[PDB]
Amino acid sequence: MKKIEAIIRPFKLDEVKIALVNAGIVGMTVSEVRGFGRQKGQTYTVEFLQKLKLEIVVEDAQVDTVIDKIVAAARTGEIGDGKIFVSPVDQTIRIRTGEKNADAIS
Amino acid sequence: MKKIEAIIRPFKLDEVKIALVNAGIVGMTVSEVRGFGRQKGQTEYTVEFLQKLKLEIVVEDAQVDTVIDKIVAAARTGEIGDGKIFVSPVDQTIRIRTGEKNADAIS
Amino acid sequence: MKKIEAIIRPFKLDEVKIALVNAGIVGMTVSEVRGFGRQKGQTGSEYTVEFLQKLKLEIVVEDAQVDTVIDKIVAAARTGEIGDGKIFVSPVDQTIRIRTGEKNADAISAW
Ligand SMILES: Nc1ncnc2c1ncn2[C@@H]1O[C@H](COP(=O)(O)OP(=O)(O)OP(=O)(O)O)[C@@H](O)[C@H]1O
Ligand SMILES: Nc1ncnc2c1ncn2[C@@H]1O[C@H](COP(=O)(O)OP(=O)(O)OP(=O)(O)O)[C@@H](O)[C@H]1O
Ligand SMILES: Nc1ncnc2c1ncn2[C@@H]1O[C@H](COP(=O)(O)OP(=O)(O)OP(=O)(O)O)[C@@H](O)[C@H]1O
Ligand SMILES: O=C(O)CCC(=O)C(=O)O
Ligand SMILES: O=C(O)CCC(=O)C(=O)O
Ligand SMILES: O=C(O)CCC(=O)C(=O)O
Ligand SMILES: [Mg+2]
Ligand SMILES: [Mg+2]
Ligand SMILES: [Mg+2]
């Protein structure tokens, strides 16, 4: 299991969501963040820009799927399109039922 | 060391916090997020986000099952959307005020 | 690759941003969070555990930069009073820059 964290432009949320659900990736967590990349917030002094952070936990088999769909959906081709961080998840538990791992993600 | 990340119904934060603290787990970070799971935002094609709270608690390996059990007992209501919990590795914890590390930075 | 998460006092954001960028650490994500540590949101006695406003910094870097990031975070954010903050380091398997599809070292670099 992996966690996928993607920072994207806020207006791209809808397209990203649709692309993931259509590919059978259903379950994600969204929050509001500010940030900068290599260009230090310049569309020198350094600025933070509004972004959205998507968090998506899946089975290792699905990681490349999640990455492609976000990239396809979030790319405009201008600087500040986002960045994606894949990190390990040791264990997932659904709270309602107590199911673990594969059963908690499907 | 591990990070436990629990997404829960917002109203359940108080109970969750007291349960954790009374079990000796003391240090957590909370943020407002939106989300959906399997049922796509529906309690009732469409997919919607609902407001959830995300709890992050970094603890030692030996405390993980305690954190999980306490969050589950406090957070469950019995209905879809009760939450989900992810445990992930943490290499290093550092207390900024003293520069203390790891077990002494969590204790 | 490591993710550094630092929970700091909100008014320290600028000092941290300056210290880090000047050390060659350029790329960061900030969010608003609430928290308590060992002293349970406190500072007469007091009985409720309270959440206080904090900022979460997330900085992904190459392994060779972890020490610099911690040093600069400590120096910028410390005040000597409780609640100064906590830093968590955790592994990153893969980084992808969405504009180009560059990965890992390229996608963390300034190039
Ligand atoms: N190393 C990093 N660590 C944590 N967050 C980062 C990092 N790099 C970028 N971010 C976050 O991702 C957002 C998007 O970054 P961005 O797309 O600007 O990356 P970039 O490397 O500058 O690529 P580009 O050249 O296409 O702009 C940033 O505003 C910030 O939130
Ligand atoms: N795979 C996932 N990745 C990231 N976040 C998730 C995932 N699944 C759920 N979440 C987050 O946890 C929240 C609660 O999920 P929820 O409890 O509805 O999970 P579920 O698997 O659908 O279980 P249930 O059948 O009990 O609803 C979601 O709104 C979302 O924020
Ligand atoms: N074990 C933990 N897990 C998750 N978040 C934590 C933990 N400990 C602290 N935090 C977060 O970091 C913030 C600052 O912590 P704080 O500096 O008060 O740590 P401390 O251990 O109490 O050290 P000090 O004695 O200097 O106050 C908290 O408000 C909370 O957001
Ligand atoms: O965030 C943007 O839209 C442009 C600025 C940028 O790419 C950056 O700060 O890295
Ligand atoms: O989040 C809720 O309270 C109901 C919706 C749900 O369970 C889901 O989207 O998976
Ligand atoms: O967060 C603060 O500024 C003081 C309270 C504190 O240190 C804590 O809850 O651990
Ligand atoms: Mg950029
Ligand atoms: Mg659900
Ligand atoms: Mg404290």
Q: How far apart are CA A10 and CA C103, in angstroms?
A: 22
Q: B1-107 maps to which CATH number? A: 3.30.70.120
Phi/psi of residue A71, nearest 5 degrees? -55, -55
Q: Which residue in the set C27, C96, C101 is minimally distant from A37, CB to CB?
A: C27
Resolution in angstrom units:
2.2
Residue closest by Cα to atom 5 of ligand 6: C41
Phi/psi of residue A9, nearest 5 degrees? -65, 135
Q: How far apart are CA C77 and CA C10, in angstroms?
A: 10
Cβ distance C38 to B29 less than 8 Å, yes or no, reads no
Q: How far apart are CA B23 and CA C91, in angstroms?
A: 28
**Exposed, middle or buried by CB within 10 Å (0-12, 13-18, 19+), for A82?**
buried
CATH class of the domain whose range is C1-111: alpha beta
- The residues facing B89 across adjacent strands are B2
When scoring C8, C32, C34 by the number of chain B Cβ atoms within 10 A, the one with the most, hence best to mutate, is C34
In this structure, which topology does domain A1-106 adopt according to CATH? Alpha-Beta Plaits (3.30.70)
Q: How many CB atoms lie within 10 A of CB B48?
A: 11
Structure tokens given for B25: 């787990």
Structure tokens given for A71: 């990239």
Q: How far apart are CA A75 and CA C99, in angstroms?
A: 6
Structure tokens given for B17: 């916090």
Q: How far apart are CA A7 and CA B35, in angstroms?
A: 15
Exposure string of B67-106, with b = 16+ CB inside 10 Å and e = fewer, is bbebbbebbbeeeebbbbbbbbebebbbbbbeeeeeeebb
Cβ proximity of A93 and B68 under 8 Å: yes
Q: How was this structure determined?
A: X-ray
Closest CA to A1 of A64, A77, A81, A63: A63
Rama region for C83: left / alpha / beta (φ>0; ψ in -120 to 50; rest):
left
A30 touches chain B (CB under 8 A): yes
Q: Tell me how far CA of residue A100 lies from CA of A37, C25, C80, in angstroms.
A: 36, 38, 42
